[model samples]
Target: STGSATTTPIDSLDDAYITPVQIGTPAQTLNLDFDTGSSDLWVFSSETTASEVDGQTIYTPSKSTTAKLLSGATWSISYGDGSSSSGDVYTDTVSVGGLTVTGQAVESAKKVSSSFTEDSTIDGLLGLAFSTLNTVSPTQQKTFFDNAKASLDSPVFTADLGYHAPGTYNFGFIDTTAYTGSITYTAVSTKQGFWEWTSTGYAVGSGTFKSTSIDGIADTGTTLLYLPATVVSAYWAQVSGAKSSSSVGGYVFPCSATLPSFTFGVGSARIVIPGDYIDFGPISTGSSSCFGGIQSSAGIGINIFGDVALKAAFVVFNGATTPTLGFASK
Candidate 1:
């Protein structure tokens, strides 16, 4: 069987994309961040402390007839941004789009950090990365995708993130209509529990491709595109009045700057990100300086092709025995 879900961007910068998911017998819907960078389907729940619960919706296991406590099971996870949540585990019937996974381990948050509590847009996260990255201890559980793959017509899911618009995530079968032309396939190294691949090269605007290989991960969870300092610096150099500010801790440019497009290669396929997409609005509302969507990943170590890059194209997370990723223009 195949299933599809509409994912909507929460903010103007496309901070994060969320998809509605159903859990339990009667079906409690929650807007979940469908993150491809990590594994572990966790949600704010009744188990969370009142102090930690902001305006986000919480899952009530007591109200779900299919909920079963996973005895002695516990999980905790933290992200690069320092936002974190952790808690006890329960197996419940979980559904995304029309795909259903019975007895799916749902991590119920017992506690959440300030960052997560402060942001009320997302109720939780549905991890799409390999189950090996699952945080559940004593016995690590499979992700919703992992459990549902067997029943799916194809062991793959695709991400179509939009810029300030609604996108789609399709499971089981690829919706050929969602993308254009042909898709370029590349072997993905899931050893690190991510959709890790190497880009053939990159170019600033219409410049020729550098013909160098750059390692990075296709992450739907991350908002910005992070690459090596050399590549990032090269891109920023093209824009007038652009600088890496110490106070801002990132590359910022005049809001009126004429930004150039960014192009990256997937094998021989070149995907171009519009200049406006790189101009991530102003630093603060009405501020003269704007933050660049592309940033340096030096501090983070691994280069990341986040939402900024993913939004420009259709991405496929193929979960076959030998995993691979497919990229296509839209």
Candidate 2:
């Protein structure tokens, strides 16, 4: 009826989080990124080009007796940063935590971009976004959550992200023990197939709270928080020696600088992200400059509340006909 999984960071910088998943008949386990920004459950498998394969584990569909090829089905996906991958489709039994789904569409990557090939820790991606965004041709596939929701006690899932530590992803029910106080529910606009919502306002450190409507998506796949230029400028301006650099990209500041905390409004609730979390690790190996977790979203078209912001609280994705998002302090 419900499921739960532990997600852990790959490195000290928490560049990405990975959770173990079981796919196919024999239950081959692989570490996958539970991405809420996209909709396609793909994997590095035997069908993938050998040249693109690194040290990551591959899913061998032939080894699973339950695997069925989805003839004439194909999929291709591209990221804003130019990373991409494409492949054929196969249906197999898939399991996450303890929940199981039969005939789950599993995309097999035949070709991948260098960025994905270079990442040794991430074996694949498990998309949690709306199924409308699935890239499969001829017929789109439902996400794991969508397919499992019918059998679950409730059509809802929760994300508990962490900073430099392991967190949790729960399905069908919300664990009251994981967070403090009641959750603040907000309307979710799924027109673009994302968990998009409007933030009530924001505050920098101990500064005054600005009451404004900021629209953004809750994306677990993205590494940083991206806001409007005005808001980003206001926050960075408070930090001495902080500047937006061309070479290093985005905003960077001295690693030793005292960073200020960031607070975002969720209805009447405020989630505060500590200053230490804003000082993303050094820009380079042993470099004195560090990348800022919050940056400008001018070119991005839309604001992105990524890991840097989500880790500060608990998030809920309700899948009812009138979907809604919930946030609570952790």
Candidate 3:
């Protein structure tokens, strides 16, 4: 159930969606979302009818001499977001970075909707998080990492999220030279397939807020950083006169001056996010708000450190060696 893992620069779609690097000799860029919740790499194809796609990018097989079709077997998928697409199966030479892997499987959607079809930024999703969540059967499922593992000089992979900047996630060999030494790693739990840890609370400047404690999971599938109500309220209380705005999705905040720099404690390690992350600006709901790096989602169950937080550090998933995640300074 475990193997060597690798990371690659996924196309950034609308600052929220991301896709794996496309495969080819010259390489055709395909937008792919890396989902730990699911395993499947699907792309919107040019052959897709107008009604089938909305704001997504579609690929034209005819444009690529390397493309191959899987005959008549059609495929479709629906996400938790209430969006869906259907398409035919295809095989081709998929490449990531300088590594090329042949006989790679891909889903080319023939029908899509406007919600997902209209977006020019994103094209598809590359499911690399887990094997069981993969949409394809054992005979059909082929992850980009699965194919690239053989070509990589080393078995390690690293994901470095740039924090609003263009971040780079690399595959194959990990550049240990980039870090000072071995990273601090945490053991993984088998329950949800997510990498999790204990967070004590937030501290700003010289001020520390230790009354609140949060136990949560770090998720790559989400966009915003979500926290429990008590945690969010406690952290915001540290900010001078910081008040919550109801219109801004109830998670954002607004202030006239720059907020304090906050640090998230993970055991002995402290992860810091600047004031920009705390202030998400104004909201359509009439509340001038901040991005609420931490928000209240009482019923949502799990606490998540979305892309906003993930892009700031070096993350490693050690599924091949052991069930654990390693975190190092970026």
Clashing pairs in 2: none
Report the alpha-carbon TM-score of model 1 versus the true structure: 0.99
Total backbone clashes of model 2?
0
For model 3, the superposed segments whose C-alpha errors exceed 4 Å read 1-14, 17-20, 24-26, 35-37, 51-56, 62-66, 70-86, 111-115, 137-140, 177-182, 196-206, 209-215, 240-247, 285-287
Q: Global lDDT for candidate 1?
A: 0.94
Better of 2 and 3 by lDDT: 2
* C-alpha root-mean-square deviation, candidate 3: 4.5
Error of 3 at 229 (Å): 2.3
Judged by lDDT against the true structure, how good is candidate 3? 0.61
RMSD of each: 0.8, 0.7, 4.5
lDDT of 1 by residue, 1-330 (tens): 888999999887799998999999899998999999999899999999999988999899999999999999999999977789999999999989999999999999999999889889999999998999999999999998999999999999999999889999999999989999999999899889999999999999888789899999999999999999999999999999999998987999999888899999999999999998897888888999999999999989899999999999999999999999999999
If both were scored by lDDT, which would come out higher, candidate 1 or candidate 3? 1
